[PDB]
């Protein structure tokens, strides 16, 4: 529980690395760790545990700019077309 360090105005220093680094996700307020329920398409339900499990590290894989843009376009078009369908139904 190192806490929260001072806010730095700038690009900062490189700490968390894609692929190489291993990360554990912790809720800020409750402090619980995000783990797998290990219950039975893996479909392993994600829960919060006070202690967690032995293998909880998460690696990071950055998405390509094309894929990110496509995902956001998908979200926007889904929203707009749902609005259009609801208007036609109204």
């Amino acid at each position: 529980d190192v806490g929260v360090r001072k806010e730095v105005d700038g690009m900062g220093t490189s700490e968390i690395k894609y692929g190489d680094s291993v990360c554990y996700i912790q809720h800020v307020d409750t402090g619980l760790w995000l783990t797998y329920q290990s219950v039975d398409s893996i479909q392993r339900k994600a829960i919060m545990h006070h202690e967690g499990h032995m293998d909880d590290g998460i690696s990071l894989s950055r998405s390509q700019h094309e894929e990110s843009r496509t995902a956001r376009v998908i979200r926007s078009t889904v929203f707009l077309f749902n609005r259009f369908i609801r208007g036609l139904d109204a």
């Binding site: 105005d9 843009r69 078009t77």
Partner: protein, 111 residues
């Protein structure tokens, strides 16, 4: 040592509005896909509603002089006051522009 605004940097344009006797911060934003017109995203209520800075960020492409600009359309630099800047939308890849058309929201003189 105060940092200086260079060209190849990602920034957001903010404006402060005092409406109904409340001082809150707004940021310029644009969807880009399916809606070219710009709008405002509130950033003051960050603790309650997350701002969408992805459609708010812009990148400075060029900061060349005004006479250089006239010459250009005739045929990591540091920003200086008076230059003509090019603002590329980070998400849509588009450029901020003064649209000729106007919504005509009782202004009749603004674009």
């Amino acid at each position: 040592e105060i940092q200086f605004l260079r060209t190849d940097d990602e920034v957001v344009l903010q404006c402060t509005a005092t409406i109904h006797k409340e001082q809150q911060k707004l940021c310029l934003a644009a969807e880009g896909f399916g809606n070219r017109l710009c709008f405002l995203e509130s950033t003051s209520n960050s603790k309650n509603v997350p701002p969408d800075l992805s459609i708010c960020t812009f990148v400075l492409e060029q900061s060349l002089s005004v006479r250089a600009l006239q010459e250009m359309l005739a045929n990591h630099r540091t920003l200086l006051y008076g230059h003509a800047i090019l603002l590329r939308h980070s998400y849509s890849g588009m450029y901020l522009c003064c649209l000729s058309t106007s919504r005509s929201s009782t202004d009749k003189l603004a674009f």
